[PDB]
């Protein structure tokens, strides 16, 4: 092992560092907003259809309970 | 101290020298190229995403300034 060998390794370590890391939280925030909008968008169909069929607005709830003829 | 002692030391000094040093600037240049490419590669995502969302190309700049809805 020579000192030139180790100094070249140190220089290449420094060069391999310093790689600029761009902003990434904006991408995550935008994806979260898109996911939320895509999650709550189909619920417009449920509310509108239930209101069209006469189901009371107070009877339109959120859950996995089996919807009856009066509750959705 | 004997002259044979010192001559053996001189011979071993000469032998410990003469160690061939291979080329090393090629490694540094290749690492620098890889580091530069890895630095500017993620900027493709930023430009493409900003163009997809309608941000004007002239509004896509480089810096740590907080990107607004119109500038990136």
Author numbering:
A (entry chain A), B (entry chain D): 7 to 78
Q: What do the authors report?
A:
Type IV pili (T4Ps) are abundant in many bacterial and archaeal species, where they play important roles in both surface sensing and twitching motility, with implications for adhesion, biofilm formation and pathogenicity. Bacterial surface pili are assembled by repeated interactions of monomeric protein subunits called pilins, leading to the formation of a filamentous structure that protrudes from the cell and binds to surfaces. As P. aeruginosa T4Ps mediate surface sensing, the first step of biofilm formation, they play a key role in allowing P. aeruginosa to transition from a unicellular planktonic to a multicellular biofilm state. PilA subunits constituting the T4P exhibit a classical pilin fold featuring an extended N-terminal α-helix linked to a C-terminal globular β-sheet-containing domain, which are packed tightly along the pilus, in line with models derived from previous cryo-EM data of the P. aeruginosa PAK strain.
In this study, we describe a 3.2 Å-resolution cryo-EM structure of the fully assembled P. aeruginosa T4P from the model PAO1 strain, the highest-resolution structure of a P. aeruginosa T4P using cryo-EM to date. The atomic model confirms a tubular arrangement of the P. aeruginosa PAO1 T4P, with a helical rise of 10.17 Å and a right-handed twist of 87.4° per subunit, resulting in an overall helical pitch of 41.9 Å. The innermost part of the T4P is stabilised by hydrophobic interactions of the N-terminal α-helices of PilA, which contain a row of hydrophobic residues (amino acid residues 1–16, where residue 1 is the N-terminus of the mature pilin), forming the core of the T4P in a staggered arrangement. These N-terminal helices in turn interact with the helices of the globular domain through further hydrophobic interactions. Moreover, ionic interactions and hydrogen bonds, mainly involving the loops in the pilin globular domains, stabilise the interfaces among multiple pilin subunits along the assembled pilus. P. aeruginosa PAO1, however, is a strain that encodes a Group 2 pilin that is not glycosylated, in good agreement with our cryo-EM density which did not show any densities that are not accounted for by the polypeptide chain itself.
